Amino acid sequence: LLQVLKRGLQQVSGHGGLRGYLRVLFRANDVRVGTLVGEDKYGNKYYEDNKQFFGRHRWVIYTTEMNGKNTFWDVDGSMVPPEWHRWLHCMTDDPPTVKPPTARKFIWTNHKFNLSGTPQQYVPYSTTRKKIQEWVPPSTPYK
Amino acid sequence: MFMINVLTLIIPILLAVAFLTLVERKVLGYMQFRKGPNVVGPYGLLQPIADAIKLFIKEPLRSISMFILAPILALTLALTMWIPLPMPYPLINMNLGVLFMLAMSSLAVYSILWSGWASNSKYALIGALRAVAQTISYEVTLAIILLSVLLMNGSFTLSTLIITQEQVWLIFPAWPLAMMWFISTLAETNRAPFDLTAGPFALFFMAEYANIIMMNIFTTTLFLGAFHNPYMPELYTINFTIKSLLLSITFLWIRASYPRFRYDQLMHLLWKNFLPLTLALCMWHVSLPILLSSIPPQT
Amino acid sequence: SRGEYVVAKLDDLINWARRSSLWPMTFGLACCAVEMMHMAAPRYDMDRFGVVFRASPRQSDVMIVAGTLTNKMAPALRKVYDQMPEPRYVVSMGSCANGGGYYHYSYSVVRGCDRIVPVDIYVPGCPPTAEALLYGILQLQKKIKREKRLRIWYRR
Amino acid sequence: MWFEVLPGIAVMGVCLFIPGMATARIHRFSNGGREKRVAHYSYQWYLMERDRRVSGVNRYYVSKGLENID
Amino acid sequence: MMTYIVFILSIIFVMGFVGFSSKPSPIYGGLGLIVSGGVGCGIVLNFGGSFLGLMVFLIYLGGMMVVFGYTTAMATEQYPSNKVVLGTFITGLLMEFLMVYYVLKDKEVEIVFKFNGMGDWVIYDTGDSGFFSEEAMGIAALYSYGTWLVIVTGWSLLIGVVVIMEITRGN
Amino acid sequence: HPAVLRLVMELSGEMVRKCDPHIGLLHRGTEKLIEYKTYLQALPYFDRLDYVSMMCNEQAYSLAVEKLLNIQPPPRAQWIRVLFGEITRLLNHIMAVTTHALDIGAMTPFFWMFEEREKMFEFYERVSGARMHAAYVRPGGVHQDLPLGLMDDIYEFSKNFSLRIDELEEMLTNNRIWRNRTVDIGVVTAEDALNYGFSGVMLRGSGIQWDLRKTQPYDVYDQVEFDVPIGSRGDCYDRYLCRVEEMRQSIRIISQCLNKMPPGEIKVDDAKVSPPKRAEMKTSMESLIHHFKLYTEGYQVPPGATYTAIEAPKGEFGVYLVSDGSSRPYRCKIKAPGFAHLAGLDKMSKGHMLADVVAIIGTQDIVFGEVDR
Amino acid sequence: MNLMITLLTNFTLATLLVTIAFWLPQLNVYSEKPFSMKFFLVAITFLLFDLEIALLLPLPWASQTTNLNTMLTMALLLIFLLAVSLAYEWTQKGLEW
Amino acid sequence: TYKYVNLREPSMDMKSVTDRAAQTLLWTELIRGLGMTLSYLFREPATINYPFEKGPLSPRFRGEHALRRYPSGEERCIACKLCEAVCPAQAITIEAEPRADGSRRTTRYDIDMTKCIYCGFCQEACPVDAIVEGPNFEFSTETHEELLYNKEKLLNNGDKWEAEIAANIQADYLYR
Ligand code: SF4
């Protein structure tokens, strides 16, 4: 029984201190840190452990204002870059720093996340020009 | 200091029932494969607190005097029914307290019927009438079994009961009587497998679960416990509290497992299985002290 | 200024208490009800968030319309909708519910559920994954976070 | 695991521990350290009334021990 | 909050009796009779009273009003006031206030009696060495002395059971 | 109150007079919409008219079009179709058990077997990509065959699931009060079983030794070892027992199907009905023409009417096609076991009480989507 | 009167809980819009068994007296009569469904 | 080949009938049920912490309805209307015009994400794999206007990630 009491102390002390323990506790839940696999732009950290079952493999820890939205709290999905989105959904067996990229020059680096309920959100319209081209009345008079 | 005693009783009933709700929800969660709830705050405490708050800010709508008078009776029972419970020094040294338990359970039946009348002529009120009938079919069993388990204790005073429980527990001289009584506690708490069944829902819900904690504390006092050592009563308080906690977890744990009866199967089972067996165990408990020459010291 | 500070902290407190748990009633006609039951699963808990399945309409916090609304269902749908407490929010789950879906060009099918109740969250998919529905419920919580109710009452 | 259900159990057990502790300390605190004299019978009440009478303090628990022998 | 606490609870007791004998709707009458039974229990426990008053409180409140409200709710409706009911309440309240007037402002009240209306601590014992109760060995008779009485009582109740099932369609 | 249906029960007190289901609260127009589409377009209507069975109805419609069209599916596709049909039968039976459990009370094995069903949804996801509405079964074989790394996962699930169904029989099934709930409710005369047109697990559970797999084997079911349980009495405890034993026989069929998987073929070798694979499409000309016209117009069908029926876990799932010689169907109807089981509710509820009526509805695998057509 | 003080405090605090449940929300926003016989047998059945419980239950206070034979005799007679009433309605198929 | 059930009689041997009587009057298998439920109590739960730990998926999941473009080139779309020809909900709306360069292109390309039943026929019917079902699952949009994707929405959507979609296609161009 003492070893279970022993291993929980290393989760507290070895995490980085009681500041970092309480931080990741009140972020959502995590006390299962101990692998420290990857990290990425927007500063997010990616932890893959093996001794847990299928599903607790890969977990993400976000940052504070990666865009300026106070995302210390209130984290969301679509705050992931795409290669880590292939990673963490358990579609593969490779951390995406093995080979991320593609050699095509159109791909963003902002990765504009979910935005419904903002002043900057999508609107539908028509991608179609003039339909029937109404008749132009001439400007000159007859008397 | 006496109103301070009252406040130290009825301020932890709110915290007790709310933390009971988080405990039963977490316990059901781990009975299944669920960590519910743990995300909302540190191990889910602010979630029941703020959820109680949200339930108080629901703004509902609507006979009005009856709708007032039912949950006020329910919650004043939930307050006024922890008075003689002898956590070592009880609040009022009643000469008889178990009959007060029976009387205020009947007042809870009043509460349920008044709510059913306030429900304004519904198939729900027919069902609530049936629930009143099943709830009233239990105070026979509880009073007769309680009579037999105090018969080995002489007086109604319940301090004599805490004297009786020093040598061995009272669970050993009456175990099947205790089993039937614990099933009757499941019965009186109106929860699983004994079901079914607007506002103020927080106050009514509070009344039901304070009734649960009362029945479990009274179960723990009636059948087992520890020794009242004076000039350190907190030892008895701790051991009593631990045993009552384990019994309440077992109570929700038995609720976690079985489908609920049919109403007519419930009546059939109640009468034709508990009621002759109660009478037979009770007449044997009557003839027992005359055949062991051990009648308790009725002072 | 200090009254503004008090109203801001109190409004944030009561909005936080509202977005705390939010137990719905599971309306659930068609196969999207099965997927609601599968987001009640052990592998995706509603109960981690205070979300409880409870068919009691008079204590319903939000309401999840999921399934295929019909002409015979719609009057009873709004009659259930009106016997609900006044802070109410609607999650339309499912391609059928949020715009008719596969049975769109048909009689006896209401074209979505805009035609009965106001809708707040649209989560599409056929069925929407429990994953996606839970992302929708988190976005509902953040909609509740941005509400400024008592601030508008104070500057009213 | 159920290591996490134990804080809820412990906090609710603290909420169950508090009223008995408060009651017992108030009895031992507002009766001069002596336990509050439980009384059920008219004999004991008569004894308690003559006890609070002969003390002179108009408090029954002062108990005026073995001094008025002379 | 004075000497006459038994008298005040008696006044509220008479108030409850007038409250359901002013002929209301019967569930309101059951409410008022629950009030009356509670305060009569208060009166008898003021006389002490430790056993018998709270005893039959179980049978009276714990066994009768529940069945009365049960039958009242299930049988008829009176589903949604009249001057005769409130007028009976007016007359009962006025006669109660007249009794309060003639008790507190005079010496004695005589309808055909001699009531000395004052502090009713009289009569009471001078603190004898009872050491059980009166009620304790009182109702702890019926078994060493009550041969005939409880036999005919239980016999009457068994006949009551068979009468009830016959009327409600024996067998 | 959730179950969703209208029921008008006129009754004498707590017993009965006459109880009638008003259904039609859910009517969508599936038959008319299939009458205005092609076959390949209107396959997902067949996927979701029953929505719990997600491959049995696929299998039924594909066998309907093959039976009308006279094209034998290739053997490896037949064995894969058999494997997914038995997985789907397993899933529908375990849902029926758990939904009767939560409809009566019995809160937790619901959650337990839903964890098992989440594992099987993971298998469906890896195979097709859908969560639940995996179309995946074209007329004329299985589209887009299963990836590498699946059969051993099925093997591990099979062992774990035999243990979990043993633990379910530990929890319930000689449970005292659930048996006391269900003893003698739902008596069914065999004449009433025939004239009222009950099919499947009702006929399995009361009397007649009648199974479509063993009377008209529509596929390679004639090569696997199993036995359908016969019901002894007209009640639902016994019918529960036959459901659980059909689950375990489905586990046996899954084990033999893993042991008998030939490495043959994916689809038919008929490039006028099944579309060609994409590489030979983008190389060859005829393949491109067949892809193009097969997806615009659809394959033509010889005219006539046919009927076929297979084992849905509710019963005789019948699909009846009327096909004018064309690229479109002309009419289709679905003989529904749920509709047939809902038909005899007066005889199943004449001599009981309303809580037991709710138990009668719950113990028959109803969805009220398939009851609609 | 100590218990009267307890009853008064609990009643008043519970009424304050009810008025917090009702008259708290100051945001006044938008105001908007046959019986059976076998129910009755159970109540009278309970009633008569409760009356015989009232006859039985002062038994343990009586346990200290000399006439033990008559006590045991009439006590067994009372429980036997109660069980005879139960067996009478049991064999005359009364409380059945 | 059948196995009919409920073939046991209650044995009139005294051992079996007294074991069933002690089972009835001692409440045994109810305690056995409690033992099974405690056996599932002390296990470890299969609950992924969702907003951090996202659930497992497949390489062939059907999500976003994105579009693609050529490597160092313009839109992979041709506007040959096969996807509107096969779309069973008829959610696809295509109006096509060629530009002045001569190659055939579009004007308007609409997906009713309301009407979309997410088959995959438009993925498995386009001859060039222009429209591709995305990997993700998050649409979750507050207004009914905003779930009606236009062509430029799909282009800014499919250009939000290429290497994801191309990685899935390179993993999955042989089974289909
Ligand atoms: S959207 Fe799809 S899964 Fe949901 S009810 Fe409609 S057909 Fe069923």
Ligand code: SF4
């Ligand atoms: S997306 Fe593909 S199928 Fe659709 S019009 Fe464009 S090229 Fe044709």
Ligand code: SF4
């Ligand atoms: S998945 Fe189906 S409904 Fe959706 S756009 Fe593609 S073909 Fe149309």
